[PDB]
Design a protein around this ligand. Sequence first.
Ligand SMILES: Nc1ncnc2c1ncn2[C@@H]1O[C@H](COP(=O)(O)OP(=O)(O)O)[C@@H](O)[C@H]1O
Lengths: 51, 51, 593, 593, 478, 229
Amino acid sequence: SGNREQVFPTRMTLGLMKTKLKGANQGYSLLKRKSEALTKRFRDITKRIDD
Amino acid sequence: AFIILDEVIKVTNRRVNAIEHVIIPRTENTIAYINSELDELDREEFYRLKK
Amino acid sequence: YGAIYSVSGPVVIAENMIGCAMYELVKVGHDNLVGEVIRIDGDKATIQVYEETAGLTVGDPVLRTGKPLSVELGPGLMETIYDGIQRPLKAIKEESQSIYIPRGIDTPALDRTIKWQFTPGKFQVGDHISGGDIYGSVFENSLISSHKILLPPRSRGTITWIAPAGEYTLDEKILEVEFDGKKSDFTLYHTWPVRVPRPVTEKLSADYPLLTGQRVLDALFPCVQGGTTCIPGAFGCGKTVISQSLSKYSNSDAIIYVGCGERGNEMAEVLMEFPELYTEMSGTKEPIMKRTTLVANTSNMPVAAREASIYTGITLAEYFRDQGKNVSMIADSSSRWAEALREISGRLGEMPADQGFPAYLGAKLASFYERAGKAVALGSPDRTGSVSIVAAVSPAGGDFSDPVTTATLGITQVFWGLDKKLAQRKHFPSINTSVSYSKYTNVLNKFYDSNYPEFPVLRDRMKEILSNAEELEQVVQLVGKSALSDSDKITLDVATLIKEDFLQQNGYSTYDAFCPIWKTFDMMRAFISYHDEAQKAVANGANWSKLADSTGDVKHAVSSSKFFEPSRGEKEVHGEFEKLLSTMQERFAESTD
Amino acid sequence: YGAIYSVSGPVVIAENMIGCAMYELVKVGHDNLVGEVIRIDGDKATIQVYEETAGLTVGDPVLRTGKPLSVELGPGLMETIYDGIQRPLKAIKEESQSIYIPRGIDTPALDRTIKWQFTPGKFQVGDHISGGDIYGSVFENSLISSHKILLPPRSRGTITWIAPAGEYTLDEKILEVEFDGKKSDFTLYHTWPVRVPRPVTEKLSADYPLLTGQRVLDALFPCVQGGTTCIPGAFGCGKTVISQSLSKYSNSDAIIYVGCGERGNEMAEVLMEFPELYTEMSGTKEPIMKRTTLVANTSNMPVAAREASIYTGITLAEYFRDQGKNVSMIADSSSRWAEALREISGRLGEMPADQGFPAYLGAKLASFYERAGKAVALGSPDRTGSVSIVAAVSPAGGDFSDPVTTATLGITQVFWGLDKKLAQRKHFPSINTSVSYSKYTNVLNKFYDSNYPEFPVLRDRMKEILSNAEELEQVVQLVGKSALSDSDKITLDVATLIKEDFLQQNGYSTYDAFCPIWKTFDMMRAFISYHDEAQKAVANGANWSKLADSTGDVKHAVSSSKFFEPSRGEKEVHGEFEKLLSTMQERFAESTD
Amino acid sequence: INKKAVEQGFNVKPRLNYNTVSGVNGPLVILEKVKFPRYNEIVNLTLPDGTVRQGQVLEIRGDRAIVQVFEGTSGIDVKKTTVEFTGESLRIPVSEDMLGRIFDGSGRPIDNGPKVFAEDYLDINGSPINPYARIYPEEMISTGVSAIDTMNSIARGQKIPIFSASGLPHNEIAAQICRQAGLVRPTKDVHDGHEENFSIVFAAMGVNLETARFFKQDFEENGSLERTSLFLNLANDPTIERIITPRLALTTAEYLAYQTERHVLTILTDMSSYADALREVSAAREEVPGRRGYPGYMYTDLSTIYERAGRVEGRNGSITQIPILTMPNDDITHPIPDLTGYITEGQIFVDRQLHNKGIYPPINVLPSLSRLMKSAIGEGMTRKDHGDVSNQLYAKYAIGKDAAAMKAVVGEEALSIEDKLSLEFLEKFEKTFITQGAYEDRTVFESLDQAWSLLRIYPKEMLNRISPKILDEFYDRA
Amino acid sequence: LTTAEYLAYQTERHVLTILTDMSSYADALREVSAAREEVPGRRGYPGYMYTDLSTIYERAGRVEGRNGSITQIPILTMPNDDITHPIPDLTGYITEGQIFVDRQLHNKGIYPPINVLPSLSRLMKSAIGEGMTRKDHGDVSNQLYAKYAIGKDAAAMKAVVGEEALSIEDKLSLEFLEKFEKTFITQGAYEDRTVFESLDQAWSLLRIYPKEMLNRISPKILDEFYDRA
Ligand SMILES: Nc1ncnc2c1ncn2[C@@H]1O[C@H](COP(=O)(O)OP(=O)(O)O)[C@@H](O)[C@H]1O
C-alpha cells in the first residue's frame, strides 16, 4: 500500500522519521511561500517587459 | 528568475507529491502496523504468562 | 443471598451464588453497589462492580435482581436528566443534598411520587393483547400530549383487569393480563434489557428528510429521519449549532441527547443550555426540555456507565419510537464511549485487537447504529416511528484514523463534517462541503419528486459549481485572476455568493434561525437560476464584468433573499420568491441588450 | 489402546498412552485418523491429527503403530498425486467414488497390484550388500526407464536369495539379506521416516545450474542443482507460476511438487497441463507427468497435514536423489507450513515467538532446507544425485521482514524476491532486481567458462546498468529528465528496454514459455551490445536525442528479439542473433557518420 | 432406480438433556459432567426464560465440553439452563426447494414460509474437494462488465472476490455481475434459456438492513428470486452466528451445484465482517493473534470458506464465488484482504480514488488480478488477441499512472512524447473503457473492439507486449 | 570457548576464537527458554539473554602472568538487518565494538561491505599512536569517520534537495565518499593491506580536502603528513 520507504521499524526510527516529516513539511511550506514571493516578482517583471 | 521559480516550484511540487507522501506512509507503517503489532505480540506473551 | 468471596479493584467474586445469569445486575455489599455478572464459574460469579469498591468486605451479601442492565421506560422519563445507567441526576441531588453522587444510591429511575393522568385505550377486559399494544395514553406534559404507554414486547395474553381513567403513580398496577393461567400485573412503567433492541413488526426504509433547519444540511447534505449521522466532535468546530438545531428545530417529536464521558464542564454547559432552549411551534413557549431527555456523563462517572450510556440512550429512543414519535438521538462524542469500551476490555483482560480497542468494537458499533431506522411499531394500533442517531466522533488527537472513527464513517450514511478553519473564519455552521458526503441523497428522491421535484438536480448543480470554484481557486493561486475565462469568473462569483449567503447562515437572527425546506428550495432555485442566467447571457453575450456591474441589484436581491421571514407563511414566501425570479428574468433580459 | 481425552482442533490429547514415543504415528478414532505424538504429560500424550478432527469423542480408541511417519518409497511413486500423508488421490477417488476425501481412508501409498518388470542388479547370491546399494532396476515408465531399486539404508548383510528377472508386485519378496542369524527379506518398496533425512555418502558442492527457463532467473540470479532457493512475494505476484515453469521446463530428471497450502485449482491444472506437455531429455517427446510427483495438500485440507506434506515431498525428492536423478523439490509455500506450525503451537498454547510463530520454526526450516544439496548417493554403484529445494515463501502483507521469510533467508543461497508493484502492471516474472541475490554466481563460473565464457561479464554489465537506472530514476522522479546528461539518458533508455523486453517474459506465450540458456545468453549479448554501441555513438559525438529515431529500427529489432521461437533450434536462433548483432553494428556505424 | 432410499434416517436418537452448566464466560459456556462429548457437536441451550440458543461444542476435556453459544451467552444461568446435546455436527436441512427462500443467518426461513422439506441434511464445512477430482475452471463467464471481462476475466468456477471499502459501490457492481453473468460461448443446452441461467446463493453477513433489502430488491427486479437463496445475517443478528452463515451458503451451494448440477454463483458480502466475527470469537478464546489481532487460523478458516468452489470431474455443476469484502482503510495489505488474496483466484479491486472522480465502476484494473484468465482466453474461447490486448492495456495503464505522477511532479512540459501519449491513453481509458452504465452490457468482443480502438492511440511500433502476428492482424482498421 | 581457554591460558598459546552465526545461538536459547515457559524478553527471547550471552562473550582477553590471549570474533547474523534486534542489541552491550557488515554497500558490489559509522572498536583508542603502528593513526581514523558521515549526510540532502543547496564542503565530501567506498573500503579477498599502506591510502584519500578543512586532524599531524605526497 503506497510508496514505502523500506525502513526498519523501531521507536527511534519512528521518532527520526516523524522529525524528518516535520522538516519536510515545514520545508514544503517555506519553499511554497518563497515560490509565491518569486512568482510575484516574476509577474511584475513580465508586465514590465511587456510594457 | 524564471529558471529559479521553475526549480523552486518543481521542488515544492516534488515535496508535496513524492517526499511528504512517502514519509507519511513510512511513519504510518512504522507505528500503526509494526509497532502496534509488536506490542500486541508482547501482550500476548504476557497474557500467556499470566494464564 | 450470595456473599462476597473476593475483591480486587472493581471485580468482586461472589460465592454460593447459584442462580445468577450472565450479565445480571446484582446489588453488591451493604451499600447496594450495582454490579453486573461478567463471568460465572460453578457457584461463584465474577461481579464487575460499577462504583468504587473501597469498602467491600468478604461476606457482604450480594442480592440478585434477575434483570440484565435494564432501563426503566415509562412516563416521567421525558424531562429528566440521567447518567449512564439511568440514575436520575436531579433526584439524587434533591434527596441527598450533597453535590456528590453517593456510592450505592438507588433513587428510582422514574419519579414514583408524581401522579399521572391515565386514559385507557380501546382494549377492554377479556380482549386478547400482544406485546406493544397501546393500552392507554398518559398526559405526560404539554409538549408530549399523549405518552402512549404500551405492554412490554415480551408479554402477551388476555386482559383480565384494566384500570379506569384516573390519576396513577407508577406503582398502581394499571393492567393485569393472563397467560397460561399465570396472572401478571403491569404498571405504568416497564423495564427492558438495554443491550437488546426493542422489537418491531417491520423495519421500513427511511425516506423522509430530517429537516435540521440549517440551510446547508437540508440542501446539500441531507439526513433522513430514521437514518444515522456522524459529526466531528472536536472543540470549536461548531457542534453546538448541530446539536441545538436538531433538538430545537428539527421535526423530531423527541430527542435523546446522550453524552458519554464528556468533560465535566462540557456537560455543565449542555445542562445549562438545554433548559433554556425554546420551541416556536407546537405552542409558543414550550421549552425543548419538555420533550428531550439527557443522558449526561462526566468523565469520572463509573466506566460501565459511560460504556452503557449510548445503549440506554438508544433504548429510550426506541421506546419513543414505538409510540410513533420520530425521536432522534444526538450522541455526543461516541469516541469517549469507545474509550469506555477499551477500558472495559482491558480491565476484563479481553485481548486488544486494533490500536488497543477490543475485537468487538466494530460489531458493537454496527449493531448500535443498526438500531436506527424508521420502523413500524410492534402490536396494534400500527403507528410507525423512527430513530435517528446523530453521533459525533472526537478521536484521541484529532487523528480521524483510529478504528472508532473509521467504523463510524463506514457505518453512518451521512457525515456532516464540521471544520475548524471554517469556524475561525466565523463561517457558521462551519460545514466543510468538500468532504461532507451524504448517501441518503438517493433514497430521498421518493420524497423530492413528490413535492419538490427540481430539488435533486438543483443541488447537484449547486454542488458541482461549488466544487468547480474550489478547484479554480487553485488556478487563481497559480496564475492571475484575469487568466480565467468569463464562465470561470461567473462560477467563482456565484460560488462566493453561495458560500456567503446560502451556506453561511446566521442562525441567531429571527429570519434564518430556522430555514424551512420550502424556503431553502426557493433560495436554491434563485441562486442556481442566477448562475444559469449569468452563464447563458455571457456564453451568448457580453463580458462577465459588464453584466455583473449592470445586474448588481439582482445579485443583491438574491443575497438578501436569505432575509425573507419564514413566519410570513409558506404561500406568501413562495409568491415572493416567484416575484424575485420574475424580476430577475426581466432584469437579465434588459441587461442582455 | 488409549482413549481420547481432549479434542482442541487439530490437537488431540490421548490418555492411557503409556508406551507412546514422541513423533510416533498414532491412529485416532474408530476410523483411524492418522496423527503424531508431540508431547507427553505423563500417560497423556498430546497428538496432532492429520485429518479433519471434527467428530472425535472422549473414549475413542487411539492405537500406537510404534513407528514414525513413514513414506512408502519405491516404484509407482512418480506419475501420481499424493495427499500430505502419502495416500494417492486417484486411488481415493476410485475407492470412495466420491469427490471428497473420506476421513480415515486407508489407501496403500503405492499401487500394490501393478506388475513391475524387474531386472536384477550386479549383486548376486553371497555378495555383501550395504545400505543404499542398487540391487535391481524396474521399468517404471518410459521417461524413468530404469528406476533403480536400492536396498533401504540402515540395513546390510549378505544376499542369500535374489529374485531373477521377471515382473513382481510391490509385495513379492525380491531378495533376502542375512545379518547375524536374522534373515530379513526385502521387496520393491521400503518405508522411511520423513523426520530424518536419507543418508548419503558425502555431500558435494552444487556447481551445475538449474536452468529454469526464466530469463531473469537464469541470467541474473541463477540457481544450481543442489541449491536451496526461496521466492518470497506478496499474493498474486507469480510465485506459483514461477514454480510451475521451473517444474515443467527445467533440466531436472525428476520433480516433487509439494503444494502445502494452495488453492486446489493450482493443483488440478497441473494435472490438466503436464500430460499434454512434453520434454526432450530422454531423447523423445514424452509427457512430463511421467517424471513429476505431486504431493498436494490444499489450504482447506487438514492444517496439521501441511508439515507432513512438506516432509513427505522432501523425502520423495531425497529418494530420487539416491538414484542419481537430479530431482528438484518445489515447495509451493513454506509459509503455509509455518502457518501450520503456528496454529498447532498456539493450539498447544506455548512459546509464542516472533509474530505468534513457534520458537523452533527457525530450526525446522533450517533442517528442511539443509536436507537439500547435490550429494553422492549412499552405497554402490557410485552415483551423484541432487535435491534443489525451490520454495515460495509467501509472506503475510508482502513484508520482507515477515518472520517466516527472515528465517527462510540466511539458509537459502538464492533469494528471488518478487515485487507486487511489478506484478500489478503484468510485468512477469515480477522479480525485484534491486534486492534479489544468488550466492551461487561464484560457484557457477566454472560452468560458464566451460560453456558460455562471457556470460558472467554480461550479467555484471546488465546488473550495473540496471542499478544505474534505479539511481537515475530516483533522481529523475524528483528533478526531471532535463538535468540528465546524455549518457544518463542512454542508460535510462537501455534499462527500460531491458526491463520491458529481456527481464520480462510472458511465461505462457509459445515464444517465451521456455527461454533456453543459449537464447538468454544471446539476448544478453544483443542488449548489452546495443547499450555499448549507443554509448559509443553518444561519446563519439552524435546526440542520443537525434539517434533515437534514426536507429529506432535497431531498438525494435532488439525488442522483438524475444519473439525468436525457442523450438526453432540452436542453429537457427543463434544465426538470427548473429544477424541481429551484425545489423546492429553496421547500422550504428552508418548512423554516426 | 431407488438408490437414494438407502438413507433411512428413520432411526430415532434420544438426546441427553444436561443441566450441568458449570461456568460461562464470553461466548463460551462450559459443561462439567457430559458423557462422551463429541468435538464439533451441536447443543441447544435452553435458557431459563425459554429462549433456545444453539451452541456448538468447541473443545472437550475428559467430561467437560467448552460449548460456545452462537447467540451470545447473555442470560445463560447455571441452575435452570438445560443443554440438549444433539449428538451430530451442525447440518443444514437442504433441498433444491431453497431457491426462492430468504433465510436467516442460521438456516431459519424468514420468508414467512415453512421449514425446508429437506432432501438431505448436508453437513456444513463439508470435507474438502479431492483436488484430483477437480476440473480446472476455464469456461469464461462474460460478466458484461468491461473492466472485468477483457481484463481480469472471470472463469466459471473462479473464487474471485470484489475488494472495496465502505462507501464504494461494491454492492452495485456485484448486483450488476449477477444480473449480467453468462458464458462467453454458451453451450445452448436449452435454446430457450430455461436452464442456461446461473443460480445464486447470496450470503449477507454482518451487513445493514439497507444493503440486504437492496440485494433483495435487485434480485426481484431481474427475476432472480426464482433462482436465489439468500442467507442474510444482518448487523443486529448475533456476531458469532456470522461464522456459520458462509458455511451454510457454501453448503447449500455445494448441494445445488455438485449434487444437483446447477452452475451457481455465491456472494459472501462483507467478508470483512466475517473476519471481524472470527477475530472476536478468537480473542474470546485468547488464541495466538495473527498479523493484526486475527487468529492464527485465519488463513485456514478463510480458505475453508473459499476453497469450496470450482468445477468437479464427473458433475456438471460449478460454484462460481464472488465474496465481497471491505478493506477497512482501503489498505490491501490488511490481513482481511491480504489473506483472502492469498487464497482466492485473484481479486477485483474497487478503488476509492477512481470513484471519487465519479466513474462507474470504480474498478481499479491495475491492482486487480485473475488467475483463471490465462486459460479461459485465447483462440477457442473469446478471440485470439485477448491475452496480449489485456497485457498491453495493463502496461500502458501503468505507464499512464506513472506519467500522471511525473506530470504532478515535474510539470507537463518535461513529459516525453510517449508520456503524453500514455496520459491521453489513461484519460480515454478511465473515461470511456472502465466507465460503464450500471445496466450496460458489453460482450467481450465489443469490449475488445473498444480496447483496440483505445490502444490505436499508440503507433504500432511501441506496442511491445502485442505479438507481431496479432499486431499485424488486428492493429489495422480491421 | 573452554577449549580456547585451555589453549590460551593453560598452554600460553595465542588463539582467535570465531563463533559463527551466534544469532542461531540466540535462536536455540529462545527455543529452550520458550519451552520452559519462562518470562520472555524483548522479542520472545529469554530475559536472561544478557547473562548467558556475556558468559559466552566475556571469556576473552589476556590474563596477568599468562602469555596467552583469546581474541574472538563472533559472527552474528543479525536478522532483518536492524541493530536494535535483541541479539545484536544485547551483543553491542557486552562486546567492545562491532564490525557492521552492511547490505546496501554489498549491493553496490563493495567487498568487504563493512560500514564504518556503525562499526566501532571500544578499545581501538589504546592500540594506536606512537610506538604501535603509525603515529597519525588515531587522528586519521577520526577524520575518515567524520568525513564519511558528512558525505552520507550530503548524499541524503542531494537526494532530498537539489545539488545547489550543497556547499563546496558537501560536494567535496560526496567525492571523498565515492573514492572512499570505491578504493579504501574496497579490498580484494586476498589483498592483505598492512596498516601502514592502509594509512597511506587514507592520506592520499584525505588529500582531497584543503589543509584548512581537515579540522579533526591535529595541526601537527597535518603539517607533518598532509603535504608529503
Ligand atoms: N512469469 C509469469 N508468467 C506468466 N504468468 C504470470 C507470471 N507471473 C505472474 N503471472 C500471473 O499472475 C498469477 C500468478 O499467481 P501466483 O502469484 O504465482 O500465485 P501465488 O499468489 O500463490 O504465488 C497468475 O495468474 C499468472 O497468470
